Structure 1
């Protein structure tokens, strides 16, 4: 019954998911002075023009915006990646306060939140097979800071009222994820894992350097979500982030 509380939080996950203490866990701190420019990286290609969203779901630990991945539409390619990866969902991690909420950290700085756009390697046929492979997933991670509002986020903010509690979903078509991207695609990359149980080590992380800014009002509505289900005592959905994990035998590479 994993979660982020005192008795079921990240320091407890290893009992049910021993890979929590593995050799390529995520997230990590990005030490900007140790990450090296890699000129062997190909230009990154984020092609979300034909993305088609279907639904939004509160799964008891975050909310997922799900996409139709039955065809070749929204794809991530290039950069560190061999081949093409298909968008299946995005979600966020955020804090109870503006001073924390991100998973990755940059010179130990915590951002207010972090966007994860999840993609699976189409060479493995579906998501389920891809998460049995060391290169089965690519997560594009984007930091959020509190400042000016992000117009492209408002449609997400505005449906959260209808999925307050665990297991609630709402139709969510025609959402364009291009509206969540910053100007620059400069990034850091490293091999890692899912940051939630089952913490599978299948992910090529691509973490953008440029944060997007969101309004205090926008992230306060994230914090009105519930971890609990309908009719249960209210436990606000905040601090659904895993702290930085040991880098072990990994190198973070810079695209810039």
Structure 2
């Protein structure tokens, strides 16, 4: 039927509806730290989220998205490998059923418990729908989560999850500050890639931070109580909503740090 993360509709099946799944710049990938090349030409990452306007949180049946007002330059990503200004439209996470898996990117084959994706689109293309049709249309900032101490800036997200348990549920989520989800360092790896879910469009400049954030076991346990299904349908826990690493093919991962 329609795509997902189960035995019968999971990542190994996606290529039948989305042939680009076997394309030349698919994501995620394994980041081989010893093979990534330090690029001294990479500019400092500029994360400008002080005027962010969060609107809503939505369970879309695959993950949950915290959506932002992207009709003005309010929360933007610039610099690093990017040319121009990319506006924040939403963030979401991928996570595991167990602490030993859940991230999409891996680092020297290591899987983290989850991965945060802050999705931005290039303002020169006018809107998000146009941007995903362009090779430099999106910039996604990826941040690994490990289980340890709680992340205080994540708790407001965790506490609203009871109100969006099932597919199609949304709730107001204003005045949330995404700066509270960032690690101390903005050192990153970067490569050209794709959306990690269908339609798997090859429109993403990936910027993956070296430094993970820590979240508590209670925080990630609350992610795993979410449902892929809609209300009134058979319950399937929303866990392991990650795509495994894809072949790097003709790409070099660049590092901003030595």
Aligned partners of 1:152 and 1:89: how far apart in 2?
Answer: 16
* Residues 47-95 of structure 1, C-alpha deviations (whole Å, 9 max, x = no match): 0000010000000000000000001110000000000100000000000
Cross-structure match for 1:46: 47
Aligned partners of 2:180 and 2:45: how far apart in 1?
Answer: 17
Structure-1-length-normalised TM-score: 1.00
- How far has the Cα of 1:157 moved from its partner? 0.1
Aligned partners of 2:68 and 2:116: how far apart in 1?
Answer: 15
Secondary structure at the aligned position of 1:26 is classed as coil
Aligned partners of 1:199 and 1:111: how far apart in 2?
Answer: 22
Structure 2, gaps ≥5 residues long: none
Secondary structure at the aligned position of 2:218 is classed as helix
Cross-structure match for 1:87: 88
- How far has the Cα of 1:179 moved from its partner? 0.2
Cross-structure match for 1:247: 248
- How far has the Cα of 1:32 moved from its partner? 0.1
Cross-structure match for 2:100: 99
Aligned partners of 1:192 and 1:227: how far apart in 2?
Answer: 26
Aligned partners of 1:242 and 1:35: how far apart in 2?
Answer: 22
Aligned partners of 2:250 and 2:144: how far apart in 1?
Answer: 25
- How far has the Cα of 1:5 moved from its partner? 0.1
| Ranges of 4+ aligned residues in structure 1 off by more than 4 Å | none
- Whether 1:237 and 2:230 are equivalent positions in the alignment is no
- Whether 1:8 and 2:9 are equivalent positions in the alignment is yes
- How far has the Cα of 1:44 moved from its partner? 0.6
Secondary structure at the aligned position of 2:236 is classed as coil
Structure 1, gaps ≥5 residues long: none
* Residues 103-148 of structure 1, C-alpha deviations (whole Å, 9 max, x = no match): 0000000000000000000000000111111000000000000000
Cross-structure match for 1:78: 79
- How far has the Cα of 1:233 moved from its partner? 1.1
Structure-2-length-normalised TM-score: 0.99
